[PDB]
Design an enzyme around this catalytic site. Structure first.
Site, short mmCIF file in Angstrom:
data_model
loop_
_atom_site.label_atom_id
_atom_site.label_comp_id
_atom_site.label_asym_id
_atom_site.label_seq_id
_atom_site.Cartn_x
_atom_site.Cartn_y
_atom_site.Cartn_z
N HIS A 13 0.84 -1.23 0.00
CA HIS A 13 0.00 0.00 0.00
C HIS A 13 0.87 1.27 0.00
O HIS A 13 0.69 2.13 0.84
CB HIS A 13 -1.01 -0.01 1.15
CG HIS A 13 -2.12 -0.97 0.91
ND1 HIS A 13 -2.18 -2.19 1.53
CD2 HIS A 13 -3.19 -0.90 0.08
CE1 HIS A 13 -3.26 -2.82 1.13
NE2 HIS A 13 -3.90 -2.06 0.23
N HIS A 45 1.85 1.52 -5.75
CA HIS A 45 0.43 1.09 -5.86
C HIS A 45 -0.42 2.25 -6.37
O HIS A 45 -1.27 2.05 -7.28
CB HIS A 45 -0.06 0.58 -4.51
CG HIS A 45 -1.51 0.27 -4.49
ND1 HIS A 45 -2.05 -0.76 -5.22
CD2 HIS A 45 -2.54 0.87 -3.87
CE1 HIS A 45 -3.35 -0.80 -5.01
NE2 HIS A 45 -3.68 0.18 -4.18
N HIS A 56 -5.93 7.42 -3.33
CA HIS A 56 -6.99 6.54 -2.77
C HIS A 56 -6.47 5.77 -1.56
O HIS A 56 -7.32 5.33 -0.79
CB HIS A 56 -7.57 5.58 -3.82
CG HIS A 56 -6.74 4.35 -4.04
ND1 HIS A 56 -5.58 4.37 -4.77
CD2 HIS A 56 -6.90 3.09 -3.60
CE1 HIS A 56 -5.06 3.15 -4.78
NE2 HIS A 56 -5.84 2.35 -4.05
N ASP A 57 -5.16 5.60 -1.40
CA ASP A 57 -4.60 4.86 -0.23
C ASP A 57 -3.65 5.76 0.58
O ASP A 57 -2.79 5.21 1.31
CB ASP A 57 -3.89 3.58 -0.66
CG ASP A 57 -4.78 2.34 -0.76
OD1 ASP A 57 -5.76 2.20 0.03
OD2 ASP A 57 -4.46 1.48 -1.60
N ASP A 110 -8.07 -0.74 -8.53
CA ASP A 110 -7.46 -1.11 -7.24
C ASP A 110 -6.98 -2.56 -7.26
O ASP A 110 -5.96 -2.82 -6.61
CB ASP A 110 -8.43 -0.86 -6.10
CG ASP A 110 -7.72 -0.69 -4.77
OD1 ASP A 110 -6.51 -0.37 -4.79
OD2 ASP A 110 -8.40 -0.88 -3.76
N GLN A 121 -5.68 -17.52 -3.46
CA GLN A 121 -5.74 -16.65 -4.67
C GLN A 121 -6.88 -17.12 -5.59
O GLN A 121 -7.64 -16.23 -6.07
CB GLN A 121 -4.37 -16.60 -5.34
CG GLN A 121 -3.38 -15.67 -4.64
CD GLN A 121 -3.87 -14.24 -4.63
OE1 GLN A 121 -3.94 -13.58 -5.66
NE2 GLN A 121 -4.26 -13.76 -3.45
C1 LIG Z 1 -7.84 -10.11 0.09
C2 LIG Z 1 -6.84 -10.39 -0.98
O1 LIG Z 1 -6.69 -9.40 -1.97
C3 LIG Z 1 -5.68 -9.95 -2.81
C4 LIG Z 1 -5.32 -9.15 -3.93
C5 LIG Z 1 -4.53 -9.76 -4.92
C6 LIG Z 1 -4.18 -8.99 -6.03
C7 LIG Z 1 -4.61 -7.67 -6.16
C8 LIG Z 1 -5.40 -7.09 -5.15
C9 LIG Z 1 -5.76 -7.83 -4.03
N1 LIG Z 1 -5.23 -11.15 -2.44
C10 LIG Z 1 -5.95 -11.44 -1.29
C11 LIG Z 1 -5.73 -12.72 -0.58
C12 LIG Z 1 -6.76 -13.74 -1.12
C13 LIG Z 1 -6.86 -14.83 -0.12
N2 LIG Z 1 -5.82 -15.62 0.26
C14 LIG Z 1 -6.31 -16.48 1.24
C15 LIG Z 1 -5.42 -17.39 1.93
C16 LIG Z 1 -4.03 -17.34 1.67
C17 LIG Z 1 -3.16 -18.20 2.33
C18 LIG Z 1 -3.65 -19.13 3.26
C19 LIG Z 1 -5.03 -19.19 3.50
C20 LIG Z 1 -5.91 -18.32 2.85
C21 LIG Z 1 -7.71 -16.26 1.41
N3 LIG Z 1 -8.04 -15.18 0.56
C22 LIG Z 1 -9.31 -14.56 0.36
MG LIG Z 2 -7.36 1.04 0.18
ZN LIG Z 3 -5.50 0.50 -3.12
#
Ligand SMILES: Cc1oc(-c2ccccc2)nc1CCc1nc(-c2ccccc2)cn1C
Ligand SMILES: [Mg+2]
Ligand SMILES: [Zn+2]
Length: 313
Positions: A68, A72, A106-107, A217, A269
């Site tokens: 962040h 970004h 925005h951040d 975003d 992911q």
């Molecule tokens: C919230 C989020 O936003 C982005 C993101 C990615 C690229 C651009 C913007 C954002 N990646 C995440 C993590 C997604 C995620 N990994 C897990 C997990 C990971 C490891 C072990 C157990 C669970 C659950 N979840 C929902």
């Molecule tokens: Mg934000």
């Molecule tokens: Zn952002």
């Protein structure tokens, strides 16, 4: 007035593409942003002296957190540039001005922690703003910088144009709260399918701008695989630090933030592309057909995560 920003030929060409990466040379990012404002908006939209001073105050108020950060901010602004350039006639002069500045700001002053962590820590910002805590702070920080002497890039707007642009930026930044995205896309989905979507309706435009903000975003999922994969390290480096701080408060974090569960990232992911990213760029592609390359890039990256799980990387 006659002073263009020009980029090396490879950047001049690739900056127009949705999947452009702004590169590891920090000192070029202000120029890249100004370049985008000039092409998107005009060489007259902002006083160059004031724009340059605004950009550097905004840079100064982003922190040295893994994800962040200032990179970004500029990355999210470039995705908005690409959406606006591929949808020339759909957006007002004010909207083009406001949304690039919104994306850049925005951040602002992000500390690398979620709204949840602020509330459980009992951070002062969580008392000041009970919902979209960091996003209300980001808007607050934008207004503060705009009110520094010599920093009001909007000074030459009329009173009402000025109130409109600040209202565009406020909604744009609040909409980057992912908790609000799910409801906003459902509504947009219903309106598109039942045929009630109307871009002359200010409340409908607001929703479309909100989805554009979510799409910009999340745009790390729409880059070439090696960019997407290396950004994911930055994203998890913040989450796991937040997980560490949850454990310090004597709360087990969600697996997403628990560095002990690194193994489950590829599956995490997958869920995120299926639950958030794919639906986001799908609804966006329905409303704005020329944003289809973001959906195609996101699908390609979904497939790369599938390959990771199947042990093929
Ligand atoms: C919230 C989020 O936003 C982005 C993101 C990615 C690229 C651009 C913007 C954002 N990646 C995440 C993590 C997604 C995620 N990994 C897990 C997990 C990971 C490891 C072990 C157990 C669970 C659950 N979840 C929902
Ligand atoms: Mg934000
Ligand atoms: Zn952002």
């Amino acid at each position: 007035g006659l002073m263009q920003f020009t980029l090396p030929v490879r950047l001049c060409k690739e900056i127009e593409l949705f999947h452009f990466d702004i590169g590891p040379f920090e000192n070029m990012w202000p120029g890249i942003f100004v370049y985008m404002v000039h092409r998107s908006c005009g060489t007259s939209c902002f006083e160059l002296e004031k724009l340059c001073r605004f950009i550097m105050s905004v840079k100064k108020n982003y922190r040295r957190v893994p994800y962040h950060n200032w990179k970004h901010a500029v990355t999210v602004a470039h995705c908005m540039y690409a959406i606006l350039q591929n949808n020339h006639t759909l957006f007002t002069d004010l909207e083009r001005k406001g949304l690039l500045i919104a994306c850049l700001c925005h951040d602002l002053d992000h500390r690398g922690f979620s709204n949840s962590y602020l509330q459980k820590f009992d951070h002062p910002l969580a008392a000041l703003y009970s919902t979209s805590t960091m996003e209300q702070h980001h808007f607050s920080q934008t207004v503060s910088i705009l009110q520094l002497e010599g920093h009001n890039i909007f000074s030459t707007l009329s009173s009402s144009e000025y109130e409109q642009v600040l209202e565009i930026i406020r909604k744009a930044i609040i909409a980057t709260d992912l908790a609000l995205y799910f409801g906003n896309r459902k509504q947009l989905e219903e309106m598109y399918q039942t045929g009630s979507l109307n871009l002359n309706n200010q409340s409908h435009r607001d929703r479309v701008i909100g989805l554009m903000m979510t799409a910009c975003d999340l745009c790390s999922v729409t880059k070439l695989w090696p960019v997407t994969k290396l950004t994911a390290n930055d994203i998890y480096a913040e989450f796991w630090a937040e997980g560490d701080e949850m454990k310090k408060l004597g709360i087990q974090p969600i697996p997403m933030m628990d560095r002990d569960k690194k193994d489950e990232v590829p599956q995490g992911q997958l869920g995120f592309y299926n639950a958030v990213a794919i639906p986001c760029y799908t609804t966006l592609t329905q409303i704005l057909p020329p944003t289809e390359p973001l959906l195609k890039a996101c699908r390609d990256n979904l497939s790369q995560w599938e390959k990771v799980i199947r042990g093929e990387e």
